[PDB]
Design an enzyme around this catalytic site. Sequence first.
Site, PDB file in Angstrom:
ATOM      1  N   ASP A  45       0.848  -1.188   0.000  1.00  0.00           N
ATOM      2  CA  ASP A  45       0.000   0.000   0.000  1.00  0.00           C
ATOM      3  C   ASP A  45       0.896   1.256   0.000  1.00  0.00           C
ATOM      4  OD1 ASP A  45      -2.935   1.109   0.429  1.00  0.00           O
ATOM      5  OD2 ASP A  45      -1.687   2.139   1.951  1.00  0.00           O
ATOM      6  N   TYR A  50       2.938   9.818   0.328  1.00  0.00           N
ATOM      7  CA  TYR A  50       3.958   9.151   1.161  1.00  0.00           C
ATOM      8  C   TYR A  50       5.379   9.493   0.708  1.00  0.00           C
ATOM      9  CZ  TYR A  50      -0.179   6.364   2.743  1.00  0.00           C
ATOM     10  OH  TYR A  50      -1.390   6.000   3.211  1.00  0.00           O
ATOM     11  N   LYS A  79      -2.642   6.202  -4.369  1.00  0.00           N
ATOM     12  CA  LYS A  79      -3.791   6.984  -3.994  1.00  0.00           C
ATOM     13  C   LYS A  79      -3.613   8.417  -4.502  1.00  0.00           C
ATOM     14  CE  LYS A  79      -3.868   4.533   0.535  1.00  0.00           C
ATOM     15  NZ  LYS A  79      -2.435   4.331   0.869  1.00  0.00           N
ATOM     16  N   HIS A 112      -7.719   9.120  -2.011  1.00  0.00           N
ATOM     17  CA  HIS A 112      -7.134   9.078  -0.689  1.00  0.00           C
ATOM     18  C   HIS A 112      -8.106   9.534   0.458  1.00  0.00           C
ATOM     19  CE1 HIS A 112      -2.871   9.079   1.302  1.00  0.00           C
ATOM     20  NE2 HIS A 112      -3.785   8.803   2.217  1.00  0.00           N
ATOM     21  N   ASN A 149     -11.299   6.557   3.302  1.00  0.00           N
ATOM     22  CA  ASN A 149     -11.747   7.562   4.314  1.00  0.00           C
ATOM     23  C   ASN A 149     -13.167   8.087   4.073  1.00  0.00           C
ATOM     24  OD1 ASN A 149      -9.442   7.623   6.148  1.00  0.00           O
ATOM     25  ND2 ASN A 149      -8.309   8.364   4.382  1.00  0.00           N
ATOM     26  N   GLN A 172     -10.950   2.068   1.996  1.00  0.00           N
ATOM     27  CA  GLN A 172      -9.854   1.867   2.954  1.00  0.00           C
ATOM     28  C   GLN A 172      -9.981   2.860   4.102  1.00  0.00           C
ATOM     29  OE1 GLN A 172      -5.109   2.895   3.190  1.00  0.00           O
ATOM     30  NE2 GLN A 172      -5.647   1.410   1.563  1.00  0.00           N
ATOM     31  N   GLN A 204       0.924   4.659  13.744  1.00  0.00           N
ATOM     32  CA  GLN A 204       2.255   5.082  14.208  1.00  0.00           C
ATOM     33  C   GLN A 204       2.216   6.182  15.264  1.00  0.00           C
ATOM     34  OE1 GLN A 204       5.187   5.095  11.006  1.00  0.00           O
ATOM     35  NE2 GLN A 204       3.547   4.354   9.623  1.00  0.00           N
ATOM     36  N   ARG A 260       8.337 -10.153   9.263  1.00  0.00           N
ATOM     37  CA  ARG A 260       8.289 -11.641   9.198  1.00  0.00           C
ATOM     38  C   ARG A 260       7.221 -12.216  10.137  1.00  0.00           C
ATOM     39  NH1 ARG A 260      10.903 -14.489   6.781  1.00  0.00           N
ATOM     40  NH2 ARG A 260      12.454 -13.999   5.182  1.00  0.00           N
ATOM     41  N   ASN A 262       4.370 -10.748  11.038  1.00  0.00           N
ATOM     42  CA  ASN A 262       3.038 -10.372  10.656  1.00  0.00           C
ATOM     43  C   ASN A 262       2.401 -11.385   9.675  1.00  0.00           C
ATOM     44  OD1 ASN A 262       3.053  -8.348  12.451  1.00  0.00           O
ATOM     45  ND2 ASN A 262       3.437  -6.625  11.047  1.00  0.00           N
TER      46      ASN A 262
HETATM   47  N1  LIG Z   1      -5.760   5.589   3.622  1.00  0.00           N
HETATM   48  C1  LIG Z   1      -5.279   6.431   4.557  1.00  0.00           C
HETATM   49  O1  LIG Z   1      -5.651   7.603   4.700  1.00  0.00           O
HETATM   50  C2  LIG Z   1      -4.234   5.818   5.435  1.00  0.00           C
HETATM   51  C3  LIG Z   1      -3.953   6.320   6.712  1.00  0.00           C
HETATM   52  C4  LIG Z   1      -3.018   5.711   7.526  1.00  0.00           C
HETATM   53  C5  LIG Z   1      -2.342   4.598   7.062  1.00  0.00           C
HETATM   54  N2  LIG Z   1      -2.610   4.122   5.747  1.00  0.00           N
HETATM   55  C6  LIG Z   1      -1.897   2.943   5.211  1.00  0.00           C
HETATM   56  O2  LIG Z   1      -2.035   1.855   6.211  1.00  0.00           O
HETATM   57  C7  LIG Z   1      -0.703   1.462   6.532  1.00  0.00           C
HETATM   58  C8  LIG Z   1      -0.676   0.837   7.953  1.00  0.00           C
HETATM   59  O3  LIG Z   1      -1.129   1.770   8.941  1.00  0.00           O
HETATM   60  P1  LIG Z   1      -0.182   2.655   9.939  1.00  0.00           P
HETATM   61  O4  LIG Z   1       1.129   3.123   9.306  1.00  0.00           O
HETATM   62  O5  LIG Z   1      -1.024   3.625  10.685  1.00  0.00           O
HETATM   63  O6  LIG Z   1       0.432   1.569  10.905  1.00  0.00           O
HETATM   64  P2  LIG Z   1      -0.040   0.174  11.665  1.00  0.00           P
HETATM   65  O7  LIG Z   1      -0.115  -0.976  10.641  1.00  0.00           O
HETATM   66  O8  LIG Z   1      -1.341   0.530  12.548  1.00  0.00           O
HETATM   67  O9  LIG Z   1       1.253   0.055  12.610  1.00  0.00           O
HETATM   68  C9  LIG Z   1       1.453   0.647  13.884  1.00  0.00           C
HETATM   69  C10 LIG Z   1       2.903   0.256  14.363  1.00  0.00           C
HETATM   70  O10 LIG Z   1       2.786  -1.136  14.592  1.00  0.00           O
HETATM   71  C11 LIG Z   1       4.139  -1.582  14.643  1.00  0.00           C
HETATM   72  N3  LIG Z   1       4.100  -3.051  14.299  1.00  0.00           N
HETATM   73  C12 LIG Z   1       3.952  -3.665  13.126  1.00  0.00           C
HETATM   74  N4  LIG Z   1       3.962  -4.987  13.328  1.00  0.00           N
HETATM   75  C13 LIG Z   1       4.129  -5.183  14.654  1.00  0.00           C
HETATM   76  C14 LIG Z   1       4.229  -6.296  15.490  1.00  0.00           C
HETATM   77  N5  LIG Z   1       4.146  -7.562  14.954  1.00  0.00           N
HETATM   78  N6  LIG Z   1       4.390  -6.100  16.814  1.00  0.00           N
HETATM   79  C15 LIG Z   1       4.470  -4.894  17.389  1.00  0.00           C
HETATM   80  N7  LIG Z   1       4.407  -3.789  16.585  1.00  0.00           N
HETATM   81  C16 LIG Z   1       4.225  -3.945  15.254  1.00  0.00           C
HETATM   82  C17 LIG Z   1       4.895  -0.775  13.613  1.00  0.00           C
HETATM   83  O11 LIG Z   1       6.138  -0.311  14.212  1.00  0.00           O
HETATM   84  P3  LIG Z   1       7.560  -0.827  13.494  1.00  0.00           P
HETATM   85  O12 LIG Z   1       7.696  -0.235  12.160  1.00  0.00           O
HETATM   86  O13 LIG Z   1       8.609  -0.497  14.563  1.00  0.00           O
HETATM   87  O14 LIG Z   1       7.501  -2.411  13.458  1.00  0.00           O
HETATM   88  C18 LIG Z   1       3.940   0.314  13.234  1.00  0.00           C
HETATM   89  O15 LIG Z   1       4.631   1.576  13.190  1.00  0.00           O
HETATM   90  C19 LIG Z   1       0.159   2.761   6.411  1.00  0.00           C
HETATM   91  O16 LIG Z   1       1.557   2.412   6.375  1.00  0.00           O
HETATM   92  C20 LIG Z   1      -0.371   3.225   5.047  1.00  0.00           C
HETATM   93  O17 LIG Z   1       0.121   2.313   4.032  1.00  0.00           O
HETATM   94  C21 LIG Z   1      -3.563   4.720   4.943  1.00  0.00           C
HETATM   95  C1  LIG Z   2      -1.296  10.626   6.510  1.00  0.00           C
HETATM   96  C2  LIG Z   2      -2.348  10.069   5.536  1.00  0.00           C
HETATM   97  C3  LIG Z   2      -2.060   8.579   5.374  1.00  0.00           C
HETATM   98  O1  LIG Z   2      -2.464   7.966   4.352  1.00  0.00           O
HETATM   99  O2  LIG Z   2      -1.330   8.102   6.265  1.00  0.00           O
HETATM  100  C4  LIG Z   2      -3.753  10.283   6.089  1.00  0.00           C
HETATM  101  C5  LIG Z   2      -4.115   9.786   7.355  1.00  0.00           C
HETATM  102  C6  LIG Z   2      -5.426   9.998   7.831  1.00  0.00           C
HETATM  103  C7  LIG Z   2      -6.372  10.661   7.029  1.00  0.00           C
HETATM  104  C8  LIG Z   2      -7.671  10.897   7.510  1.00  0.00           C
HETATM  105  C9  LIG Z   2      -8.814  10.845   6.721  1.00  0.00           C
HETATM  106  C10 LIG Z   2     -10.067  11.099   7.331  1.00  0.00           C
HETATM  107  C11 LIG Z   2     -10.213  11.401   8.693  1.00  0.00           C
HETATM  108  C12 LIG Z   2      -9.062  11.513   9.478  1.00  0.00           C
HETATM  109  C13 LIG Z   2      -7.822  11.245   8.869  1.00  0.00           C
HETATM  110  C14 LIG Z   2      -5.950  11.134   5.783  1.00  0.00           C
HETATM  111  F1  LIG Z   2      -6.818  11.764   5.018  1.00  0.00           F
HETATM  112  C15 LIG Z   2      -4.670  10.955   5.303  1.00  0.00           C
END
Ligand SMILES: NC(=O)c1ccc[n+]([C@@H]2O[C@H](COP(=O)([O-])OP(=O)(O)OC[C@H]3O[C@@H](n4cnc5c(N)ncnc54)[C@H](OP(=O)(O)O)[C@@H]3O)[C@@H](O)[C@H]2O)c1
Ligand SMILES: C[C@@H](C(=O)O)c1ccc(-c2ccccc2)c(F)c1
Length: 303
Positions: A45, A50, A79, A112, A149, A172, A204, A260, A262
Amino acid sequence: QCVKLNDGHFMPVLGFGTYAPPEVPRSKALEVTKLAIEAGFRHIDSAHLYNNEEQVGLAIRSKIADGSVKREDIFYTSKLWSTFHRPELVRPALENSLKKAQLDYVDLYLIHSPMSLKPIFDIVDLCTTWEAMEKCKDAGLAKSIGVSNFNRRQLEMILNKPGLKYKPVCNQVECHPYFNRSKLLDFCKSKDIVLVAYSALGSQRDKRWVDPNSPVLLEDPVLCALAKKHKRTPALIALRYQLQRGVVVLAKSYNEQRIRQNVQVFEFQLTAEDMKAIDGLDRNLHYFNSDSFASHPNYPYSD
Ligand SMILES: NC(=O)c1ccc[n+]([C@@H]2O[C@H](COP(=O)([O-])OP(=O)(O)OC[C@H]3O[C@@H](n4cnc5c(N)ncnc54)[C@H](OP(=O)(O)O)[C@@H]3O)[C@@H](O)[C@H]2O)c1
Ligand SMILES: C[C@@H](C(=O)O)c1ccc(-c2ccccc2)c(F)c1
């Protein structure tokens, strides 16, 4: 395995999250994306936002180049950022993501966020944005298109558009045991649209958007008890929960051992009592909780 999308393409049910904050050097995304693929991730993703699409595409091409996988084995998502909602900006932004990544197509292109920004908020009719996405699918720039979103009413706006050609294949959204989105999930299932969960491990916790006081999901005492019961980890419980509810789940890690770990989500199952204990954690907590989203006219969490 994969879920079949409503346009007949397939999305792998576990995906690698590529986002890292700007303190992290750009070259890390290259390294960890190759490791994710080596570990068995097939769904990756990314996003224009990003600032890592060169490295992620390079990771993908390198794993093709050395014979690990073929392009058609990888599911790559980008996105459309919210400064590019005006319909005439949509295909050039996609073309730009494709050139950064050096790929011929993305498997998935998403709006996005519904919150349009000046190309400061903008007002854009997202149905016209959607029509421009459909043209990107017709040109073969994106195999599938979808949104991110979006709340229910925002998704209905698209489903209800006169002359609609392609339904979104997915929405998503933030989704985890503190904010499990079950009613939005039922709505998506009834329309044959896949809910893809981000921040599935609790985000994060980026200081720009997330209150440091907020409960840390992976320290949750019910997730911890469940990890001990199954001899797995709180992360793995949180991922497994999503699979069992029919949700496609992303997982970001930049750490070799956690990347690994996950993919073990496929190795065990939760029982109905486990799933109910996890459902009992739901407390309307979206980690992204900032004035910079919440003041927007089309903020999705106002409902
Ligand atoms: N569509 C949107 O608007 C939107 C918004 C937010 C995120 N996203 C996408 O969703 C992806 C995932 O979401 P996110 O970045 O918020 O993070 P997440 O998947 O909720 O991760 C949170 C933290 O979990 C830790 N982690 C991962 N595997 C672990 C494990 N087995 N044990 C303990 N900790 C673990 C990681 O730290 P480490 O790196 O130290 O392992 C990571 O920083 C993003 O990277 C992005 O691709 C999209
Ligand atoms: C930073 C970026 C992402 O893809 O991580 C991001 C994270 C959260 C949102 C979001 C979208 C709707 C409500 C609150 C937050 C976004 F529009 C973009």
